[PDB]
Structures are given as structure tokens and as C-alpha cells.
Amino acid sequence: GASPSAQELKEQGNRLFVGRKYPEAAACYGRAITRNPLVAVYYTNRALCYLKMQQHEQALADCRRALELDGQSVKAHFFLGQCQLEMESYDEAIANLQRAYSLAKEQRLNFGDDIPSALRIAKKKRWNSIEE
Numbered sequence: 213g214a215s216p217s218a219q220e221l222k223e224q225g226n227r228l229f230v231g232r233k234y235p236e237a238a239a240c241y242g243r244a245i246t247r248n249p250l251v252a253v254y255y256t257n258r259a260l261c262y263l264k265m266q267q268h269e270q271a272l273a274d275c276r277r278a279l280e281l282d283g284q285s286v287k288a289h290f291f292l293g294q295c296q297l298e299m300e301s302y303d304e305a306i307a308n309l310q311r312a313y314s315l316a317k318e319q320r321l322n323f324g325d326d327i328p329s330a331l332r333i334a335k336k337k338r339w340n341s342i343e344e
């Protein structure tokens with residue numbers, strides 16, 4: 213047969229995510245990791261699959277793996293915050309989303325209003341949690 217390159221399996225998991233096959237996509241990213249475990253995006257992409265699967269702990273651990281490879285990652289800080297938000301770790305979530313925002317400015321990355329909106333939503337969810 214043929215065995216793909218790590219890059220080729222990342223491409224395949226990307227297509228599987230867009231096809232809404234999230235456990236399959238996540239396994240594809242694991243196969244990419246087997247070939248090259250030093251590529252941050254494989255872990256962040258797999259964390260998005262885990263989030264869609266409502267597996268917050270597994271997504272969180274992949275965000276940590278990505279952050280050990282790229283400490284400047286907007287995407288890893290953003291999805292770390294999103295994992296924490298889903299787990300109701302509100303203050304940690306907001307700080308990581310704010311760090312994502314600052315990094316994106318430093319890097320001149322345009323996500324429209326997505327990060328400010330994500331913060332507003334996070335702070336409102338936190339506020340509602342405090343007011344009971």
C-alpha cells in the first residue's frame with residue numbers, strides 16, 4: 213500500500229473535520245502525530261475535534277501539548293480558554309482569551325471581532341455564574 217506523510221494526514225483530518233466526522237478526524241491527527249510529534253497544529257486541530265465531541269479534558273491536554281511547542285500560538289491560547297470556559301474555569305478562560313487577543317495583535321492576525329466577542333461572551337457567562 214502507501215503510507216501518507218504527516219502533512220498528508222493533516223490534510224486528510226482537515227477534510228474529515230469539514231465533513232463533520234470528528235472522531236475520525238481526531239484519529240487522523242493522531243496518525244500525523246505518530247509520524248511527526250513536533251508540529252503544534254496537529255494538536256490544536258485535534259483539540260477542536262475533541263471540543264466538537266464534548267471531550268473537554270482531552271481537548272485541554274492537546275492545547276497544552278501545542279503550547280509546549282509554540283508559546284506564541286494565538287490558536288492554542290484561544291482554544292485553551294474555550295476548553296476552560298466549557299469546564300467553567302472562568303477566570304483562567306478569560307485570561308487565556310485575553311492573551312490570545314494580545315498575541316494576535318502582536319502578530320497582526322485578523323480574526324475580525326471574534327476574539328473580543330469571545331471575551332465578552334466569556335465575561336457574561338462568568339458574571340451570570342457569580343450572580344447565581
Ligand SMILES: *CC(=O)Nc1ccc(NC(=O)C*)cc1
Nearest residue numbers: 226227228229230231232233
Ligand atoms: C478551508 C476550510 O477548512 N474551510 C471551512 C469551511 C467551513 C467550515 N464549516 C464547518 O465545519 C461547519 C469549516 C472549514
